[PDB]
Design a protein around this ligand. Structure first.
Ligand SMILES: O=C([O-])CC(=O)C(=O)O
Ligand SMILES: O=C([O-])CC(=O)C(=O)O
Lengths: 380, 380
């Protein structure tokens, strides 16, 4: 129990216990019973959900998916195994992984019309716009299984999203440059096949560099879930209205499209580019991922920053992931798209969770009204 | 002041005062200082923003835009005057309205390529999908003024949205049926011109019914803002990341696409349709808008429900708006689109507000972790 005393006064609140981390003080019917609200910029101290998907403690600093630490999955799992784990909450036995992997492998081709629909975008349009556009359009082609309540339908569009979203991001890249779209090769991994779709020409056969593959696969594990989140709390809110799966991911994708969140990688490069386009090099808590990322960065290795890094190791992140992506040949305007591809499983897991609850109710936040109280006067 | 006492105990919280309605108890750095969070399903009792845009008291029951009651604007204003008011926070003098009205009237045509892009959707696709798809695509054609920080750019895409979104919704309708798209007539009102775009053929000239016009214009005033909201808190969250204006509206549009929120009108008709497709008529707080809406409904007047209405006036809303829209010839799958057209000014006003603040910070909600704590075992 807690007790709260407000000018009207005064109230007792249940405490809800967390299997790890901070516990919650359950607001009741806070107004009334009390005619008062909490005010909390950013929702930074408010929790509206229970989930058992990702635990983090930065101070500690821990990141686990379903209890498993990130260093272990990064080093020992795969992006697909991680998709499975996050979504259904356990690691898969050999049959379960293969059948899940099989199910995704057979849904990677888009409807030819949805392929053609890329034709309407302008001559070399930025991929981030194209991808949000195309994801909303999915409901136009896969009307088939859109019922948020029916599962099996959720299952089929969970599959469709995990399979088709890399295909879409690879096509948006091809569109952003002049290049033909390729098709899925059944003989590749999803991640390896994603890399062909992105980088393959019809002028030659494509061989994925294995070091490249493992680097990308790992990096999607590192970015698979991180919640709660701007992006995912957005998937949660839209789903709140019982929006369908696609429409909720799209909202996650739109939230992701902003520099503070999804394009932080892109901001860093932008920092870098300027310098190379101006006179140079002058003056005026550890993440478990960060450390794994520096490691894979130092191997694979930007033209150039490294000075920057060395330079202020002397005198006084998202930074490393940017360099890597660029190192693998990804142009800066694919970074946020790469982010969504990796986060997709988390977006999905949270939405599914949200659905499986005792019953969710729609999101209805408050405000502190700070305006007027007046009468209409005719326009003269 | 308030004081909160928790098992660790115990803390004092500032109170932030509202010019009307409930006041807030400002969470501080709630964890730590305390290692605890609030838990509040739906955010129902939590406020993360101050705004002075819409005040409501349902119990009372009041709805005002910028201090002005809804009955007065509905009966005496226009949808455009209401757009202006909400966004810039005051009613406009004769020059300001005309110049604002002029500015919108000259931006209603889409880029011909963005027009053509409707060609890629399937043969008679539902409008709601098409509209989310096309709104995300705006950033592809109006790269021109996308800087969330630069105003004047915000101004130009505020205009572009208010002008072009009815055009887009009218085209999505035309697409949903077989029909040619028409173009804007400079000699019409936005709302009247919207109705031509929706219902006009090239086989005859279009005359808008004035009773029809006034009915639609009023109805967008009734739906112009209502916040805070699922839909608008979603626009607020996306904007939180500094997403651009279009990407934030798109998120509002996706949140709107769900039965609890934007498609409540559509749910009612769906209730109605079933009956007409099964054996019939059997058994097992006042909104200020509601009342205005019944009034305009009874004049303009569904095949049929009215029995339903009479029938349980005997024995024991969003309902009335559905009948009207259908009465004006709108098919059920335009209802949520009609909803967005009306809400657009509110979406925009809140986003702009959010921007003009001392400085917003990104949305970072919490959770109550309720999961595991385990170690990777190889897949056998
Ligand atoms: O994963 C990242 O790069 C950061 C992130 O999503 C978050 O704070 O949610
Ligand atoms: O306006 C409506 O029809 C209901 C609504 O948006 C809300 O509760 O925010």
């Amino acid at each position: 129990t807690a007790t709260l005393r407000y000018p009207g006064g005064e109230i007792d609140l249940q405490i809800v216990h967390a299997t790890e981390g901070a516990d919650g003080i359950a607001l009741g019917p806070l107004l009334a019973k009390t005619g008062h609200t909490t005010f909390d910029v950013g929702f930074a101290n408010t929790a509206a959900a229970k989930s058992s998907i990702t635990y983090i403690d930065g101070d500690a600093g821990i990141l686990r998916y379903r209890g498993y630490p990130i260093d272990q999955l990064a080093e020992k799992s795969t992006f697909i195994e991680v998709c499975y784990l996050l979504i259904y909450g356990e690691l898969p036995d050999t049959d379960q992984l293969a059948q899940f992997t099989g199910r995704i492998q057979r849904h990677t081709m888009l409807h030819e019309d949805l392929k053609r629909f890329f034709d309407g975008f302008p001559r070399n349009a930025h991929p981030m716009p194209v991808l949000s556009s195309v994801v909303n359009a999915l409901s136009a082609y896969y009307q088939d299984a859109l019922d948020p309540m029916d599962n099996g339908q959720v299952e089929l569009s969970t599959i469709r999203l995990l399979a088709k979203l890399p295909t879409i991001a690879a096509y948006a890249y091809k569109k952003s440059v002049g290049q033909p779209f390729l098709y899925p090769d059944n003989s590749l991994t999803l991640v390896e096949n994603f890399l062909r779709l992105t980088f393959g020409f019809p002028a030659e056969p494509y061989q994925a560099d294995p070091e490249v593959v493992r680097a990308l696969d790992m990096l999607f594990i590192l970015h698979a879930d991180h919640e709660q989140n701007c992006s995912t709390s957005t998937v949660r809110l839209v789903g709140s209205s019982r929006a369908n799966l696609f429409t909720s991911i799209s909202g996650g994708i739109n939230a992701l499209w902003g520099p503070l969140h999804g394009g932080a990688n892109q901001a860093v490069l932008e920092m870098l580019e300027g310098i190379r386009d101006s006179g140079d090099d002058v003056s005026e808590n550890y993440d478990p991922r960060a450390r794994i990322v520096k490691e894979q960065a130092d191997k694979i290795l930007g033209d150039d920053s490294l000075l920057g890094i060395a330079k202020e190791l002397e005198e006084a992140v998202d930074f490393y992931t940017g360099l890597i992506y660029r190192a693998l040949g990804f142009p800066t305007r694919m970074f946020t798209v790469l982010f969504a591809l990796g986060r997709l499983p988390g977006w999905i897991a949270h939405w599914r969770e949200m659905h499986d609850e005792g019953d969710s109710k729609i999101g209805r936040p408050r405000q502190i009204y700070t305006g007027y109280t007046e009468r209409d006067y005719v326009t003269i």
